[PDB]
Amino acid sequence: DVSRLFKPRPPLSYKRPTDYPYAKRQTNPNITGVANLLST
Amino acid sequence: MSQFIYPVQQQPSLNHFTDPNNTTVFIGGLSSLVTEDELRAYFQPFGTIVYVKIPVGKCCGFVQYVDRLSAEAAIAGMQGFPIANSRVRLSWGRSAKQTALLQQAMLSNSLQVQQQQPGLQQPNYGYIPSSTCEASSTMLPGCQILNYSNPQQVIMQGSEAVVNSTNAMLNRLEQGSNGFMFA
């Protein structure tokens, strides 16, 4: 009766991820420069 | 108070049918044209035999095997098999001394008490029940290390037993056709 009450839930099922991988996560690169706006 | 209890039961009073150590087979309905040798020939290949008797004029005999397995196989296989044109009904029985004791005890109607047949004193390792022998060994499990003499002593089975069995089979097939034995 020591740990007969804290029976955990069954292992969580696996679902294919719908997000980007931790290696591919990034913000926007190739942020274009600010000098072109000043002219026009 | 627990809801699970071990089962308990009453004993069936040890007659010849309810004895697990009983090995003798009571053959009834013999035609009186059969003798001890022919009956032994009938009941030999199911196992080794301690004794075979046919009371004179009582139209019934007894076969005392060594193995309970042999006796059960004999009863299961030889049932209704006609010896000397008369069908035969097999059932369990008792010995000769026990038969005489029971007859005197029911003539005197005193007790009618039976005694259980002796056991083999387990554990036994050499023997394989329901096995036949007629006449080195590494004592490996596959073979049969020990066996019973054909009538009684105990002999260690060898590799030449298969040769001897075929030799005797051919001998009794040649001679038995000429007619020196009905067995």
Binding site: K7, R9, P10, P11, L12, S13, Y14 | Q3, F4, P7, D67, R68, L69, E72, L120, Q122, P123, N124, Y125, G126, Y127, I128, P129, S130, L140, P141, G142, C143, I145, S159, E160, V162, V163, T166, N167, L170, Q175, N178
Partner: protein, 541 residues
């Protein structure tokens, strides 16, 4: 100096590995070597030497290939591989172990499912594994643990709570060792029902209305009516329990109480006669019950203690032949028992006959070639006579079927073809070392035609007569065979054959062999030649 090289340059490793390689079938040296190789790796972890791990894996695999029936080492190897971090190879090990038992092994199934629960984590696949396992090993007498695992998994995962009823209903009828626990579960779970509609979990509405006279949609006062339904259901459960208790108590009282050993120990073990007798009786009882799954399970369960005895292999093949009519099944069972049994003589004979029956003669020819090659093509000099005799019979059958007859009247040359006659005469040349001389002579006699008897006499009996081998010359059964060969000939007239015997054969024997040749010769004389008996006894004074 690394741990692996230090181990491999240790002297004890050479001695243990040599004992193992010298005595492959003892398993004491196997287990000692495995304990040593495991213990020499003090930490078992993911960072220990890859070479050492590969060595441990190969040692375990070699032992499991040598002894296929060790459940505990399958489990231990799979658990060690699980500890090493990868579970795919653990699954492969468990599946290989299950296949080694033909999927019927309670301990392996229990440990495999206990490991599987933590790992698979996919409801459909896990439950399909459970359904597959129950089909093979569910009817075991000691199958309480497997059903406990199944019930706890269902109660933990399922939320509809109908599969629990549908599985406990099946469990209620199997004669298990611990049927009482499941009956108590059933009684409590029926006792905790609280409304009429939940009785539809038990059976169908039409069935309840028609058999038990219980109406689920009964509207009104439902307290006493639900109590009536509970009483009727408990009566039905009591009758089910009566049947199951009778079955289980009979089985335990007769058979299961006498069996003490249920585990495969080693090829060097001996099993007791009482246990053999009770195993045979129990197998017969199971066959009589006529349940195919239960019979297969009981045979595979009986193979564990007495695998190396071959009587259970023979009995299993006989059952598959004459009760299920499955000759391919019998061939497979005997072919598998060929690996295990230590006698192999009766199994080889029965396998020969079965393969002849299935009209598969190419496999028969291949088996004959293999058994001849196993003795370096010198099977004619084998110490054990039975293997040679069976091989000679079936090789003669194949030779007759393959080569056209070289004698008249389509009298097929059985043992008179130069391929087999060479072997027969080579065995006859030993003359005291072997055991089947008389059997070979007597089985060579039977030909019964003019040219065939002429050939047999001239090649075997005349040649031995001229060589004068004392062992055969003083053995009266040889003279009986010669006289019987001549006398049963269908070509000679009676006067010709009597003349031939009396004036040729008998004078050819020496008088100093009288005290040994007289019994069999007189036995033949009394049976066939009562008139010539006077001549015999006069000449043999």
């Amino acid at each position: 100096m690394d741990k692996y090289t230090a181990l491999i340059h240790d002297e004890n490793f050479s001695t243990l590995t040599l004992n193992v390689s010298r005595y492959p079938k003892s398993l004491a040296y196997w287990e000692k070597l495995l304990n040593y190789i495991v213990k020499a790796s003090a930490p078992i972890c993911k960072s220990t030497e890859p070479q050492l791990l590969k060595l441990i894996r190969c040692t375990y695999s070699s032992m499991l290939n040598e002894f296929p029936y060790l459940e505990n080492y399958y489990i231990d190897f799979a658990l060690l591989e699980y500890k090493l971090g990868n579970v795919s190879m653990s699954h492969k090990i468990f599946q290989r172990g299950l296949q080694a038992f033909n999927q019927r092994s309670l301990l392996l199934w229990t440990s495999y499912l206990k490991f599987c629960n933590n790992v698979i984590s996919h409801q459909k696949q896990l439950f399909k594994k459970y359904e597959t396992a129950e089909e093979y090993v569910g009817l075991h007498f000691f199958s309480g643990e497997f059903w406990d695992l199944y019930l706890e998994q269902i109660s933990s995962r399922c939320t509809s709570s109908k599969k629990y009823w549908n599985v406990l209903r099946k469990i209620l009828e199997i004669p298990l060792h611990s049927f009482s626990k499941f009956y108590a579960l059933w009684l409590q779970r029926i006792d905790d029902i609280m409304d009429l509609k939940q009785l539809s979990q038990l059976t169908s509405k039409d069935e309840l209305l028609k058999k038990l006279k219980i109406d689920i949609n009964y509207s009104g006062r439902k307290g006493p009516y639900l109590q009536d339904a509970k009483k009727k259901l408990k009566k039905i459960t009591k009758e089910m329990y009566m049947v199951v208790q009778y079955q289980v108590l009979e089985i335990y009282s007769i058979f299961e109480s006498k069996i003490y050993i249920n585990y495969y120990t080693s090829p060097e073990t001996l099993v007791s006669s009482d246990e053999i007798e009770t195993w045979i009786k129990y197998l017969d009882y199971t066959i009589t019950l006529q349940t195919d799954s239960l019979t297969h399970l009981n045979f595979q369960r009986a193979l564990l203690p007495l695998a190396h005895y071959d009587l259970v292999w023979i009995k299993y093949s006989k059952w598959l032949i004459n009760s299920k009519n499955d000759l391919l099944g019998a061939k497979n069972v005997l072919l598998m028992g060929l690996k295990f049994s230590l006698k192999k003589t009766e199994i080889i004979k029965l396998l020969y006959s079965v393969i002849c029956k299935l009209n598969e003669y190419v496999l028969l020819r291949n088996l004959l070639e293999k058994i001849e090659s196993s003795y370096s093509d010198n099977v004619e000099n084998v110490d054990d006579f039975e293997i040679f005799w069976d091989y000679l019979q079936f090789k003669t059958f194949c030779q007759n079927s393959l080569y056209s007859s070289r004698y008249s009247d389509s009298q097929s040359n059985g043992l008179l073809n130069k391929e087999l006659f060479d072997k027969v005469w080579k065995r006859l040349s030993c003359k005291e070392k072997k055991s089947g001389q008389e059997i070979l002579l007597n089985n060579l006699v039977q030909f019964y035609s003019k040219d065939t008897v002429e050939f047999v006499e001239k090649n075997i009996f005349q040649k031995i007569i001229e060589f004068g081998w004392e062992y055969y010359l003083q053995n009266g059964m040889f003279w009986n065979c010669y006289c019987r060969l001549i006398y049963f000939d269908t070509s000679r007239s009676y006067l010709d054959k009597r003349q031939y015997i009396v004036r040729k054969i008998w004078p050819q024997i020496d008088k100093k062999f009288a005290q040994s040749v007289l019994p069999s010769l007189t036995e033949f004389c009394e049976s066939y030649f009562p008139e010539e008996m006077d001549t015999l006894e006069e000449m043999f004074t």
